[model samples]
Target chain A: GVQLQESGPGLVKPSQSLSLTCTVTGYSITSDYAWNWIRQFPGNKLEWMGYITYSGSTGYNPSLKSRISITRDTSKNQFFLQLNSVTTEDTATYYCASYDDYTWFTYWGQGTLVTVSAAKTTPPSVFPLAPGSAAQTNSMVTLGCLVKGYFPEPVTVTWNSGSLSSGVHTFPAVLQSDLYTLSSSVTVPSSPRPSETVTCNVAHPASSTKVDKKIVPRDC
Target chain B: DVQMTQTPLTLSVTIGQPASISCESSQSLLYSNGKTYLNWLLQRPGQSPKRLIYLVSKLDSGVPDRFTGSGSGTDFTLRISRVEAEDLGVYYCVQGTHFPRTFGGGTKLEIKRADAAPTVSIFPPSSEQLTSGGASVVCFLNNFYPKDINVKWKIDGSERQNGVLNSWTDQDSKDSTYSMSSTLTLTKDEYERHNSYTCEATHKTSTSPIVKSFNRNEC
Candidate 1:
């Protein structure tokens, strides 16, 4: 059984470069296998970074063409991923995958989260709302958190309804010309009392603080 | 580049039931070497993906016969005769005939209430005289369901940390279970000690660890 492990920088500034390494054990790098780099952005979209074949040939995603380089050191049984001129859109969890001639990716390393943004410069915008204007009694209500205009990457959003905590389903962040936008939804118990408030908290390392937004459901 | 696509984005099956996933490639996956570069894989939640089939229809070492890969050129299929609980995960079909390579979107398998235990056995090098150079002991784990397993070696009740370990978790066509193995090398003097050496297999489904032991007398 072969195993792969990934290591790289955790943060990067805009217009800078990012580098990552994948170390392989239990199998020789020069063997009949190829190593690939993949990344997942905040919005859950996947990016096929590139791959270094066993014979040292390489292929890359055209979007990152020229800016991305994939290389390997057979003696160390490892491969490397380098991306230059990275911006906030490049922030993602990068993973290293192993492939054979007959297969795509049979194995992958645990992903490492990398962020590219200016520190304390920009923070995520948050909006909390109930999907429906009216709250139904003794039933669940759909609550949403629309977080947008965030720079760099990786902002975790959570929802709280009164004393209850809910699991959030976040959509992948999408770049809208300039800034990026994302949204998270959760199902919470609907309360008849107008006093009950649902809170959406957005947290990111760049902000150095968590931003909380609250909304009160309208009584049906 | 060859493009691969899988159907039935999601599937739910009970244990002992049959399931099939389809993979279609944009172009013929046949390579100049005369072999199709289509294969099947599964990525269990929170675990690394594993190759279930390679070189078109050929099963990887230790793969259970229950899981079969068929088809050629632009079409391929991976069939599981009796799905097990451990089979729940995303299945991907990959094409390697093209230089850049590609994979299908993946078919998710949702299995319920299936579990199987592992059977382990050890094989020590045949002749005692060969201990003059060193002796190698091989351990095999068979019929295990759910691939997550750990193997450890103990000599005279002491843990032996340095050993070459190789394991495979693939479905068997006959039993619909998985098998794995590991090998340990020992010095001639260590083999002569007559102390008990044990291979311990730890699986998430088993309450007690499976142990296989050997000594000079057994050989």
Candidate 2:
């Protein structure tokens, strides 16, 4: 029943402190485990930031020894990660994972992409990625496109297929620091044909950019 | 990570019923440290991995007695004396005994008759997808769990050429359930005859396979 979820900003200002939280559930954070902060860079490069053990002791990756701190709020059963003086190079998906003495990374957060952005206007880190339930209800499936870390707000979203108007739901963009993050989704019945793909077309007028990315259903 | 194979890839256990899964490693999991490097972790739907038993059969602190690990060397098993709603998720076996620390293809566990069971679809090939000389058919057994669901293809009511091997088994992030796509290619003559084709996917622990047929004239 134990689980870990990462919560933090989608974007962090350059040179500022980047903070993230790992909220633990079904189990107490004060147990005998190392709550960790790990990051995956742009190229799939990974860095094990550090960990705070149950006894309040800490160990960190040598490269980040000086600038990183792993702390916990015992009452909330949550642990935290703070890295100082971040740069654009620090942009990565930050995952909060759990480790035992010799038992490593047994539990992991879905990961939160924390992009350390420069002040200049920017588009989302890459093209948006696609959605949720009721997938089995009517041969109908719902898909979502996540558009995050873009600036100057007001982005346009259109689907390559799926009749629009009603089934479309757009989550208004929210500005966090200098960037905006939002998501949109479309609901449609499964296509009768096997060779089907849905694309999410996005336009960020501020950055003069238009992006088109296909949303392929995961074949698990 | 080391390559691992887990059996009963998919399961649907009734509440309070017992469920078990086995994991086999290619080599001995015994490490030099006088211990087996195999570990067991559970990932509930929409949750992180939770280590239950490590160092073979030793339960972690606060682990309920109901969840147990057994076996050693290259084979191991994880058992739940009684299934619970909260126990619904995927179970994975890990082996630190190896150089890179291998993981078993996780075993997905779901409550019997739960909404999480996968939906199977038989996609008859459109001529555009058929390159030359023949017809192609794709059978997608997706959004299902326990990871062990099986699918077979049949032609004119007969199993065809050993049928298709499943491919691209991946997890849907939206729902912790799993998906897989398999293909069945037929010769042009088969296509010309408009011969009936069938995709039989095992469901409910393989007790019954959902059978869907493909015929050009029907469409």
Candidate 3:
């Protein structure tokens, strides 16, 4: 049972190091598999940083060869990534992924955004925060939304033009490096709403943005 | 949240018998680099798994023409037009492009056995059995010979070791073979998280563990 999740600082100062942790569940890290780190920059350019194998071998992207290091703790079943001497260009969303010897890159993490800029004010970025199962029940479907990488702590999450009270749960904003991140969930009472979408609404002082995603019902 | 599933976990083919294995993923195996990352591997007894096919249908160097991989998208198949003795071993299909590198429970190919491995079916929790908190699933093993099969349950891709009701071993008759079933109770949270449920059976006849999958997405 392999499940991957990435966690770390949302903000890192220029020339400082950026560190992240990938918490894996279901599958043991000591198994015969290759754990990896992949990132996507502001412009959609992707890069493979490096990976650590079950036996503790390492591989790098060459471009980041000198600055990247991948290591792990078999006891914790968690892998770590530390990239030294980071610059603004190093800012990107980093993901934890895996590789089978014969297969190419297979599974991936949900990813966390790491910014290299000194904090002033940053808009919160949002991603679909649904159950990994992505299954919708007949009467009601749970919809989750993840919001992170913003400076101010008063950000809001919504499913549509309306904010939520009941049928919703929002975690308190977590702070790091003067930036904030949090998760909010909503359970809509209906699904299979054709041509309909549940929007992820984010409201922060920097600027407000919304992301729309589709949720289809599964016939049980 | 993609998961891999391979069917017919045991193949006891007398030389020249046609055989096939199915590998299915919940999502497409297509990679950003324009290649399908699904690969087929063969693990001989006492040896590590080695690639026999890559990119869905491209045979690895030195792989025989007797073996071929086909299909694309979510459904894929690997066929042995004429299985031979040299092909004896455990076969696994890996989807290296899903959210997690997913490997199917291997299928074992060996010389014919008078007593074959049992057929397995993992049934998902019924709607009535489902609650906001949890669900209960059942794995049934039937018509096996020799009464030597051990059944296990795995979540995601590894063994599940707790809260399992795994004893329903039965026999129709000595000549009729054996039938048994195991049950696993899981939190609805795990299922909604898209966790995969598998029932794996091992018999003395082969090294392969026959596996049947029950995924929430397929509900």
Candidate 4:
């Protein structure tokens, strides 16, 4: 049996670098397995950042090509992932794994979720747009609630309706365009009688500002 | 870059039944050492993804024997002998025999689910490039469930019935959901007006439509 462990900083400032160590036990670093770095974004998108093969050859995700470097210290049976110039989008749980070379990870270390935040002078502009009406139920109507132009990736979006079950979607603040967009839609039953109001509520986990947007169905 | 293809973008199974995911690589994944670089992974909700099997058929430590990986050359499969509640998530097959390892789009297993509303983002032409008399904006929609999605464009809040230009949907290999993109072309005058342009996605499962709107300067 083999084991892998990951250690790194939990908090990283914007534009700073992140260095993580992956130490392997019960297995030799010079063995046939490859050491790899993987991360999961807030959106559940898993990215294979790169890897350091047993022979010391390296490979990386092209998107992070310029800022990612994987190196190893064979004498200590460990390898490291150095990511530079990280932003809020880079905030994710980083993991180290034993790569089988066939593209699947065999042994994985517990992941460390890294947070990247800077002095907050700016906040995202939140706009909840009209959700197009789809199929109607015998007693209700579904509304799509979308939030755009948000930043720093907030924690949750809760709907204030009679009955609501939603799957939240988060898109990190991307550097490519310099804007962060995250959105979600909840299905709510139309007012059974009338005079009912529905609203989308967003309260940042880190802020006191609470934003709410209302919606009234045109027709059920 | 090696291309990996997965099938049945979505799977629905009951507990105690077997399930399998297939992956085919454009080139043989076999290395010079006679070992193929094919692996399987699962990502559950709210948790980081974990590896289940590696080296084609070798199960990761603690992985149930029910989760078996098998195949040779360019063809491969990940099978679960008895489906369990915890097994649900997105499953991906990755190949590493070549430089820049590649993963299949993804296969999503559901206890039984359908029709995910699409989440959309629009990319408008750059502010400086809007003067060229012609530009294009792209709408990227991901994490939608089911396979079919309808995308349309609107200019200044009014739906444009024509001139969509192009759009396409791709099945996610992990959880069997879908993603799509639509490109809307605009004239310089339209681009300069800073008029609002909206991209809409309609799915069969949801009664509501997902929409994202952007202005020329926003990009």
Tell me the TM-score of each prediction against the true structure.
Answer: 0.50, 0.40, 0.36, 0.50
TM-score for candidate 1, residues paired by index: 0.50
Candidate 4 docking quality: incorrect, acceptable, medium or high? incorrect
Q: Is candidate 2 or candidate 4 better by TM-score?
A: 4
Each prediction's DockQ? 0.07, 0.07, 0.03, 0.13
User: What's the C-alpha lDDT at position A204 in model 3?
Assistant: 71
- Candidate 1 vs candidate 3: the lDDT winner is 1
- The digit string of per-residue lDDT tens for model 2 on A65-127 reads 788888999999999999999988888878898766365336778887676666666887433
The C-alpha RMSD of each candidate to the native structure, in angstroms, is 25.7, 13.4, 21.4, 10.4
True A-B contacts kept by model 1: 0.16
DockQ of 3: 0.03
On the 0 to 100 scale, the lDDT of residue A68 in model 4 is: 98
Local accuracy of candidate 4 as per-residue lDDT tens digits, B1-219: 788888979898765788999999999988998888788878765445677878889877778878888899999999898887678788988877887777787888875445567656565543333454555565667667665678878888887765454333323335446555455656777666757888888887668887777654423
Writing each residue's lDDT as its tens digit, candidate 3 over A1-220 gives: 5678999877678999888999998888887788988776643334557789889998886667788899898888999999999998887878887756454334567777787777666776554533323343456655555555677445666666564444544555556566665655555665533236666566774444445533333354
Docking level for model 2? incorrect
Query: Which scores better on DockQ, 3 or 4?
Result: 4
Which candidate tops lDDT? 1
Please report, as a residue range, the 10-residue window in candidate 3 chain B with the lowest summed lDDT: B167-176
